[model samples]
Target: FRPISVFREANEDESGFTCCAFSARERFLMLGTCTGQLKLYNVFSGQEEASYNCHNSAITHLEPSRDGSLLLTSATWSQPLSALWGMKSVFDMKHSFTEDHYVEFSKHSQDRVIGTKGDIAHIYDIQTGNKLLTLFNPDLANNYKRNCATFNPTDDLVLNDGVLWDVRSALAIHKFDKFNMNISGVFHPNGLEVIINTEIWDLRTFHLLHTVPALDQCRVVFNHTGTVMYGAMLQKSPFGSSFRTFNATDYKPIATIDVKRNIFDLCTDTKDCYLAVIENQGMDTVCRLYEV
Candidate 1:
């Protein structure tokens, strides 16, 4: 595989960069650090455009709206922080929760977001930050694993991955048998295929289509074009700093990138032109920008 150019997003620090996302509309990359710091960089140029000290704890989740007007971020202990484009405060989601898992925008919509906490998850208005609705596992009494909530490509339904169902306005639409899920189910951009853990399930048939079979529990996602899929080793993965890119049509390995260190998260721009890898560099962290 051919390699691209590499660059850094910020000066080395002990915060240890943690998560990243790309804005579909602005073509900018959003980076979050474990020390509650947030930074925005140009996807193509790899230059810091702005920075924000919005969260008080490690920034766990960072997602920008499809319309490119708002950014959603949540920390390990604080509520969700919403900011408008250009780093202006919108509204902080005042929900009561002990732990936060992930925050995701309703794909293709700038109006809704799903915030997953330990036991429950909520969909909220993007502007007002009002609680639109709450989703719960059917067997709440026995809920054990962390909730993985994400929106479908159409933005009409959400995959909580508990019962593995798409919910519409608090009602269940389609429920599939649960699996040994490692992360949230990510839609295939076409809304036809959904991935739970390493398994891809066909929505039409609701059957297993493929298993990525990664070395460890890595986060896998289809690129925006749906022509390629990329899976990166999370902090918990023991496969070493490895991220694999696969051809979507054939579901075969296409290339590999390994930094030989601990990777917290990895992401590409909405256009899939740049690959940003956040890896632990001893007591600090760095964002290695690789052009794809």
Candidate 2:
């Protein structure tokens, strides 16, 4: 098992920080502020690299493309915007799309985006600003919004609500409706394993591998080498504080970090060399960087 160590730590001046995202190469980190400011930092050097006036309202969401070439930001009152950048050059404003209730990127394609508004989910070509497809669930209605989606290993199939839909064929290849709730998932680094909702399953067969607690909010991420799986859980009232690591091969418990606070976000670098965590501390926010 890989060990965790504190590589660096930095505190943000703003208190209402909403979200953060890491670059694909894990060299830079971007954070969204509740005051419409976007901050960038050099992870290794712990230096404030740059800041942007991305929006006029709180940046409710921030996402860096899988290639780390683009950063997406969304606000409560303003339209969503994107910034394209490289390692050497400062980020440049690319283009803006119509704001949606929620947005996610295609795992394999950097220019494809999936957005959800109410019960409908739409696919868009980010480069052309064109709508490619529309997806909706009448059963979910307005009661449950289709808020999460991701591309499978092949990029041909998109998984949401246990239904694998073929993008080209415009049909669903398989459905595992046992998971009746709207869920988010990620493809393993090897693209052969998937952790959907609170369970790990074989990517090819859709067979169950491991089961975690079915909490209201949960996030599962893999280490850089895909040997370790880290998960965090949160609830509403009592404010649950749960974080654990598991052996990816057998889905057995390995270690747990007791922070005694709600973990807002968790991520690891592409090399599995560092881990970053954002924790909720009453009215303040704490960001921690750990070396693994």
Candidate 3:
């Protein structure tokens, strides 16, 4: 519940930072700059450990692997050089993939990575550098492309096409016929319930539990202890923004964080020991780290 640092660089040239993420161990901070610089810093010590020239254009995605062994970087301009780095002294480049716009690693196994390339979903084996499977809509006339996808914690299903598909059987279990587009959702840490489109639902029956209003375009994340929910809402220009902390069991508001800059990202550590906010003011950016 205390502010650690306000990271800002007063530079006349170049744009501000684009994306940031913390290591799985919560000991290091990884930031991608507008000038295509990927920097890593020790969170507690506030000392830089390594940096890499990942791309020529502004970076759009910077994701660390679940085990903190790999780092992934992507840019805005082109698929110039998408790289995967191994967590070592110099952060060595371990593997590279092409035409990966949306990518994610398996929750339980790091050997598999799911990536969206054009109109198809590709599953890659990290160790062999080979494609394991390709998922696509069989209907050629559907004229649909996947925007994003993710693996459930148990790896039992893949959430896509507004439905949950069995990972092994490749069969659709249920379809969200009520809605045509799925904006966003997350499964509870306990794996029994899910929060989708402002409403909590049962994982097995897909029945509604409760709903919250005005949650659109907001980043929803659960704290480490799984007893509270944290979110940052985007506000219209000239007006201030706010972050909310809520009780998980009843979904009631508990606390608020008032901020001035436009919120770009919000994240908490694995243990809920820290909460970080990324804000943008024109070409300058500031990151606020808070202890919890």
Candidate 4:
């Protein structure tokens, strides 16, 4: 039940999107905007089923839980570090922070979430909004690199500033050798490696594994099982408007899609059925859909 092009039902909000995400089943597409609004588009009808101004500023990030029962979103630039939603499209709770923000749910249980604010991060219980753990990088927090926190696939560790913090004691279990970059990072879903920029580092040895070419400048992501990788073909490609794909196993170039600029973010739906490209164009941001 996907459509060719998605359009907002109004004449103008001219509201550029900040980010987007799909629920577990791809039943709906969630788009966050610069005007502090979240819109839910029906994947079947391509019409907005609901809209919420739940955030006070631009919604810079969005992530849904494994079961698709919960949506963790945030607006870092104007405010807040985290907001939880049931996606009824129901409003849940908000957790605000002073600086850089990123929110992610637990790998096993949707009942808990990890959030970052400035130099520190915390785990909060979803139902009660209580701080379950505090992950403080006394040494790293004061450095030039900002705090970027993310939970591993197995839900045992959270990475921030090259250090892997153990969940039980909230202490540095393993520290990666000095990776100073100014962006969010991710795991390989195998839970054995970490990805920063275009470089992949092994969790077992804390060593550089592989660095993908043509993807060094791209914001890359792998499919749920780590098979297919996707990122926009943004720069230095003989000049163009498209996106590039890759084979995760081989890290080789796969295909290129012809989609134009202002591509705010890339997200794939549940079941790996389709990929949604957020071609941000004010209120008319196109949800360029593709078969995975």
Candidate 5:
């Protein structure tokens, strides 16, 4: 087992609330608050390095790609516009303008970004500040904004496979003749063990993977090594409180860490020992180190 720590905290800012985005390298942390303030921090030093405003709406979610090169921030509204900020290592750049490519939610590609509207997803070309593609309304498909999406960390080869996943809440009514449903996402953290949501998804998996009593979104993390796995849960009431844990193959809850309000935005480290929560209680955001 590994010990957890409370790293740092931030008081409610001008926006009256805050959100977080964890970097792929676990060194940098970004805070998006209800007041439309977007702040950047040094994870290791626990220092407030930079801050900026992202308009008036509350920051709903933050997703830093597994590459740590771009920052995807979303806000609440009819067309919940996503904002993309390019990010580089501290030593890599001295300014944000010279830092990366920035893009807005309305401009991304349809098939590339998930969701039903331009209001939820945005894309960026980290180095040039260019808007790449939007997965929500890609011309090839029109799934809408509710299809929460993300990229796979282990396989760069699969990254081009048009964003590896898009999960939605269970339907309102189980009108189908059977309890089974079709799911197509696969998570392979390594070579030994792999997890995939099958056609015959068992009730155990159903409850474990889809049960969200309070939140608007959720997702499961499967460890290919078989030592542990985790399910990340999120809700809308808290604004930015997210949850995560590592468990045995049997799906036993071992360690639970509360992340930013939307746990769906968090991601495990490439090594799986540490998890970068988008945000935490008291604005306490950190790359929580874990082990078994």
Candidate 6:
């Protein structure tokens, strides 16, 4: 196994930042930067699909709503702790920095960022451009900072009432709507099946479900039906790593191909038969085909 050549490489112009899976649709790639810039790429053409400078500070993390209508970008700054970006307007490349809405931040200075400080997770209103919840209050900062915050896709309750899974301080769920919570467990992937090293936990109970130990597994893309997820992972020495797919519902992995280096991000295709994996190199990550 050997690291594959860059499908597209980076130049001195644009800083190679982080890329995220836009949604199950897989038409666009959400690339983030240290300067709060978000870029969308077309999956098929290996070209710039859309771009926007959404935040004044560097984005620490980005998460998409289950439906992909809204995107939340968390900053390392105290200035608007978080910013919400609309995906629809992004497709046309008409996105503007003014489109962002404020949310919450850390208690210490924005730059300090220590322990579990600030609002670790922010959920926004899709249409109103408002923050529905500033989760992990000061009391829960330590727990919320464990492994990044994620929403429970199974919950029917919207907004704060939905589940916010924190990996630290014994698993717990914060229901912002009712101001109540339940403590449980967290889950992560531990098997070699995972190309990258990762930990996935159940939000409701805080119990570990799977551990993708491969560090190369930055972004995992699921099929529209939510049955399968595809991304890339690191390979044993000689062979670097390559993009691959797995069953989302069952977490059954398929295709163990070899490639060069690491994969940074990936998104599912609109057809659900292919996945687009992006790496440090621009434009060149493979849009490999798979069966969902």
Best by lDDT: 4
What are the RMSD figures for all models against the true structure? 3.7, 4.1, 3.7, 3.9, 9.3, 10.0
TM-score of 3: 0.82
Please give the distance, in angstroms, between residue 20's alpha carbon in candidate 4 and its true position after superposition: 1.9
Please list the residue runs of candidate 6 whose C-alpha ends up more than 4 Å from where it truly belongs after superposition. Answer: 1-17, 22-28, 56-70, 75-78, 87-124, 127-146, 157-221, 230-245, 281-292
Clashing pairs in 2: none
Please provide TM-scores, in order, for all candidate models, with all chains considered together: 0.81, 0.78, 0.82, 0.84, 0.50, 0.52
Off by over 4 Å in 2: 1-14, 24-27, 44-46, 66-68, 81-92, 137-146, 178-184, 201-209, 214-216, 236-240
Query: Which order, best to worst by TM-score?
Result: 4, 3, 1, 2, 6, 5
Best by TM-score: 4
Q: Is candidate 3 or candidate 4 better by lDDT?
A: 4
- RMSD of model 3 against the true structure: 3.7
Q: What is the per-residue lDDT of model 1 for residues 1-292, given as tens digits with 9 covering 90 to 100?
A: 3345434646764545677887654556678776677877775576778777867777766766655556667777554343323233553333322344667667775577677765467787756667778777555322426456787778776777534445565766565555553554567777888766667888788788887766235567666688888877545322357788888776688888778777777766677676776667664556666767
Per-residue C-alpha lDDT of model 6 across residues 239-277, encoded as one tens digit per residue: 135756666655667766543435544555456555544
Per-residue C-alpha lDDT of model 3 across residues 93-147, encoded as one tens digit per residue: 6766677765677777777777655545567778876877776654421222324
* Candidate 1: residue 22 Cα off by (Å): 3.8
How well is each residue in 168-247 modelled by candidate 4, as lDDT tens digits?
78888765655444544577677777876667888888788887756654666677767888766434121235678888
- Each candidate: what lDDT? 0.65, 0.63, 0.66, 0.68, 0.40, 0.41
What's the distance in Å from true for residue 267, model 4? 0.6
